[PDB]
Write a protein that binds this ligand. Structure first.
Ligand SMILES: N[C@@H](Cc1ccc(O)cc1)C(=O)O
Ligand SMILES: N[C@@H](Cc1ccc(O)cc1)C(=O)O
Lengths: 317, 317
């Protein structure tokens, strides 16, 4: 209703399985939602903030967020949004990264809240011990090859190539949604733009096994110049202060182009509409002052590293 | 060399991965070969004799046969040679059928021979305890979806439809060959006509994991009338004497059409070429006597049920 309308105004809604159905439920009940994060490195980066901050927004509106660490799926790899087959990381590597990722996730959510405290979960717990036979029968029987082949993630790669390993990833993600739906009353799955296929596969598996639940995806952050958000000369802008210092983090944001600043304010900050609108007028009237840019930098750096860290970055600049 | 030339004369060779390579090896070494049999009922039937008797022929020529009971694969189901998706049988059902099948297989092979005694194995032993993650990574990474889609068994069903469950079967069969190759020095896999794809997938997995082994398939038995071998008005001609009595079994064979009798003699019997040739001349000269037909009936009934059982069938007729 207003949550969903707010996300729309902000530009955080790409697609939704059934908008009126989801608005209804959001407005009528405390929704358990989840977002999945796969350890593909030893730290999250700014590519993940959309999904993280969106969860936080859901939590503030009284819903209960579940942050899922991809301990199992990180051992397979998601072809989604990747033009190329990826190399398999080792169990020890992935296992190690999962622990770190778990730590950074926790920063963004409330665990003290009564009624809607978050949960951080690891899909290793339920995928780890599953035998191939059970998996092929209990999950696999529900999907035709023809349904799976039409997925953007697979359609996009058949000529380029894709192993069975990555082709099957969607089943695992599918299963996550089912398990979370059954064990935690999870009714909504959110993800980036490229997760539509995987999310809808989870709904298909739920539908076919239960015969209810929704899917929402966030759009890819755009730049007016048409370059890839987060693609710096420096390389990746990490969330680990030891890979990307608070000063570097702060600078990244402070250098937002005038053309993008208002879209980033909306996306990454907890500034109200009237605050964001005021900055737009300020952006128009006095663009050399760079008030929108400093506000973004402080807002996002505090979120991620805190006030002390922000204080340093400010004094270092 | 002569084994392989004999099978050719007999019409038991449909395709071979590399004929000269396999003839060489057969002639130079004691080859460990295997054939897989999936419990799809509580008894084998005449559709399976081609593969069983062919193994026996291999064993008589000094090679070591491995009869594989599909305890794991019977829980997935092979789309090969089936125009339609099959219903999943239960573990208890399949488990029960495996035990029976094991019993009938053993009838046809030598376990007393020193140097080449048979082995009856169950793929449940190695597929049963395998986790989905290991399976997707260790087997799955080796196959592209594009390789698998081109398989006759899958090509033949994409429009008709096929679940992921059955689509993936080939991986399991693939893995069987690998495991048997590693643990038993298995260098040759034989199967019916429809198994080409599955056999070659096992070779692809071996090649890609080891960088040697061969594949041979038997042709489908033909009828001059163009009907499906084994398709009786009675229904299936089982190998279980309690489903299909020795008398019924005997009758089936005795009713072989003159047009097929010589092809069946070659395929199902251990009669020499000069014996089989002599019967052809007898078939030409005195076709009302039905000497080819009685010889087939006695030969095959003795194999499957024994002399006592043959004696009864003869006296009952
Ligand atoms: N596939 C998602 C992560 C994910 C993992 C497991 C899930 O259940 C959901 C999402 C990604 O690559 O970002
Ligand atoms: N797929 C074969 C049986 C089989 C099972 C396992 C194997 O490894 C090989 C063959 C059939 O349906 O007849």
């Amino acid at each position: 209703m207003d949550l969903l309308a707010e996300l729309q105004w902000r530009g955080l809604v790409n697609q939704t399985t059934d908008e009126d159905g989801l608005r209804k439920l959001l407005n009528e009940e405390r929704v358990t939602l989840y977002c999945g994060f796969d350890p593909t490195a030893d730290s999250l980066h700014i590519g993940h903030l959309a999904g993280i901050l969106t969860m936080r927004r859901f939590q503030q509106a009284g819903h209960r967020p579940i942050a899922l660490v991809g301990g199992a799926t990180g051992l397979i790899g998601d072809p989604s949004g990747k033009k190329s087959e990826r190399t398999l990381n080792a169990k020890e590597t992935v296992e190690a990264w999962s622990a770190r990722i778990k730590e950074q996730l926790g920063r963004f959510l409330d665990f003290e809240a009564d009624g809607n405290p978050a949960k951080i979960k690891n899909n290793y717990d339920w995928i780890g011990p599953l035998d191939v036979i059970t998996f092929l029968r209990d999950v696999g029987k529900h999907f035709s090859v023809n349904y799976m082949m039409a997925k953007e993630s697979v359609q996009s790669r058949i000529e380029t190539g894709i192993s069975f390993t990555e082709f099957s990833y969607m089943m695992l993600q599918a299963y996550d949604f089912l398990r979370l739906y059954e064990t935690e009353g999870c009714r909504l799955q959110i993800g980036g733009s490229d997760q539509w296929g995987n999310i809808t596969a989870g709904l298909e598996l739920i539908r076919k096994t239960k015969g209810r639940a929704f899917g929402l995806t966030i759009p890819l952050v755009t730049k007016a110049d048409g370059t890839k958000f987060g693609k710096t000369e420096s390389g990746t802008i990490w969330l680990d202060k030891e890979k990307t210092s608070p000063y570097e983090f702060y600078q990244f944001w402070i250098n937002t182009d005038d053309r993008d600043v208002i879209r980033y304010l909306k996306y990454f900050t907890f500034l109200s509409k009237e605050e964001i609108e005021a900055l737009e007028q300020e952006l128009r009237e006095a663009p050399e002052k760079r008030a929108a840019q400093k506000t973004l930098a402080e807002e996002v750096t505090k979120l991620v590293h805190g006030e002390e860290a922000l204080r340093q970055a400010i004094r270092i600049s």
